[PDB]
Design a protein around this ligand. Structure first.
Ligand SMILES: Fc1ccc(CNCc2ccccc2)cc1
Length: 460
């Protein structure tokens, strides 16, 4: 039986509003309702992996896993296996996979992060799951961020705390946070960003929603505006939104948005908003295609509607050769030539690089670079042709051209990373000097750039 080179992944996010679900939730897993929906001819075809994030989830793990498994079995006639389940108070992530994938999935990790201090600590935060699927690392984050139209900056803070502190994936990747540890990272949840229009416009907004005229509303969505100003989710993607706002509904219908201030809301307005979102970030030049992104119309127990997204995701096989794993393949080499980092830092330490990759036996430390002043005020760290020649464990181009090199630039004085990035080995040519580039981030914010040339030798 050949190993797959593609899988499909279902992402669901649903803020359940502390209510049990209705008896039928199959529309969710079928990507049926509003937005970019899945074709009827696919309804019996199981996704490879289902990742369900809930918020305000009132059920036990057992109660929810029985509902999920029974739902998928009814759709697909497949009994899914549980990869992982992790709950932080009423925030939960479930990962289910087809039985044939059980032997393909390993290195399963779970973690959570609680956001806030004192007053603001006790119910918001994130859960996450990571694992290997053959040669491919996958990470999944379900976050419930701070509520309220006025609190976008708090949400942005919650995002940075989650990507700093959530401990998933390979712990040897110590300079790297979750935004660099996975081939594919999916981040979803009740992100709680609102449509930032005046309160007095509530009925106008409702009118626009009834006319399915979302364009002007989306131009005021706080997550899209914060992302466009590089305040949050830097280097993540989101599919175009073509479904109505998923919050705040009167329960047991979808005919009414309940936006007016009430004692139960702390006297806050909840104008119709796209609270419930799915974003992703994949390594450069890896196949990832969103095939659905929408909301259900028939699940009405909560004041939120469920959101679905589905993806094609490229995956690679576990590779064994006669040499690696457990030695190098002297036919392979990676040379980084005429490289320089451009950093936003005002520090004057010396810097060294680390190169991390599952195509190396272990990470490689460079010599210190040569610091110069950039003509617009910046630090430029030059590495010349001084960089260590990297020795991959396998030289076969069918393996090596699918790999990635993570780069950290670290202070000699403190050994702290000032920036992290990723270079694809999916080159136009081997044995040929070719331009490379990555932005560098630290704690998910832009700190610089790395650019230069690469020369890749494979067994071909
Ligand atoms: F649904 C799932 C439940 C459990 C798992 C864990 N499988 C680990 C494994 C891999 C290879 C051989 C033996 C064990 C993976 C998926």
């Amino acid at each position: 039986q050949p190993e797959p080179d593609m899988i499909t992944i279902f992402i669901g996010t649903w803020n359940m509003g502390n209510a049990p679900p209705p008896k039928k939730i199959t529309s969710w897993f079928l990507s049926k309702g509003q937005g970019k929906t899945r074709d009827d001819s696919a309804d019996y075809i199981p996704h490879d992996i289902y990742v369900i994030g809930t918020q305000e989830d009132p059920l036990s793990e057992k109660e929810w896993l029985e509902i999920l498994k029974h739902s998928l079995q009814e759709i697909t006639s497949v009994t899914f296996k549980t990869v992982a389940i992790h709950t932080l108070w009423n925030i939960r992530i479930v990962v289910l996979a087809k039985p044939e994938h059980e032997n393909r999935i390993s290195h399963i990790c779970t973690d959570n992060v609680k956001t806030g201090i004192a007053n603001t600590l006790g119910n918001k935060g994130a859960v996450g799951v990571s694992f290997m699927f053959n040669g491919t690392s996958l990470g999944f984050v379900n976050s419930h961020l701070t509520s309220g139209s006025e609190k976008k900056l708090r949400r942005n803070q919650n995002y940075m705390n989650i990507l700093r502190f959530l401990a998933l994936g390979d712990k040897k990747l110590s300079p790297f946070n979750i935004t660099h540890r996975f081939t594919h990272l999916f981040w979803f949840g009740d992100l709680n960003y609102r449509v930032d229009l005046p309160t007095w416009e509530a009925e106008t907004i409702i009118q626009k929603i009834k006319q399915q005229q979302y364009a002007d509303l989306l131009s005021h969505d706080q997550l899209l505006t914060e992302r466009r100003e590089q305040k949050v989710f830097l280097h993540f993607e989101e599919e175009e939104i073509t479904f109505a706002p998923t919050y705040r509904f009167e329960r047991l219908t979808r005919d009414k948005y309940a936006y007016t201030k009430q004692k139960a809301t702390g006297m806050k307005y909840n104008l119709p908003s796209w609270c419930d979102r799915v974003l992703w970030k994949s390594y450069p030049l890896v196949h990832v295609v969103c095939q659905s992104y929408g909301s259900t119309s028939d699940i009405m127990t909560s004041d939120h509607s469920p959101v679905f997204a589905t993806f094609e995701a490229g995956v690679t096989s576990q590779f064994v050769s006669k040499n690696g794993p457990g030695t190098v393949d002297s036919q392979g080499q990676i040379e980084f030539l005429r490289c320089y980092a451009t950093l936003k830092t005002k520090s004057q330490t010396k810097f060294y690089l680390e190169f991390h990759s599952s195509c190396l036996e272990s990470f490689v430390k460079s010599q210190e670079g040569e610091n110069e002043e950039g003509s617009e005020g910046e630090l430029v760290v030059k590495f010349g042709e001084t960089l260590p020649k990297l020795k991959p464990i396998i030289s076969d181009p069918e393996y090596l051209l699918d790999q990635h090199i993570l780069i950290s630039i670290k202070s000699s004085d403190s050994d702290e990373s000032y920036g992290e990035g990723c270079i694809a080995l999916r080159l136009e040519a081997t044995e040929t000097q070719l331009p490379i580039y990555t932005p560098l981030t630290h704690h998910g914010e832009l700190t610089g750039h790395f650019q230069g040339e690469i020369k890749l030798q494979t067994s071909q």
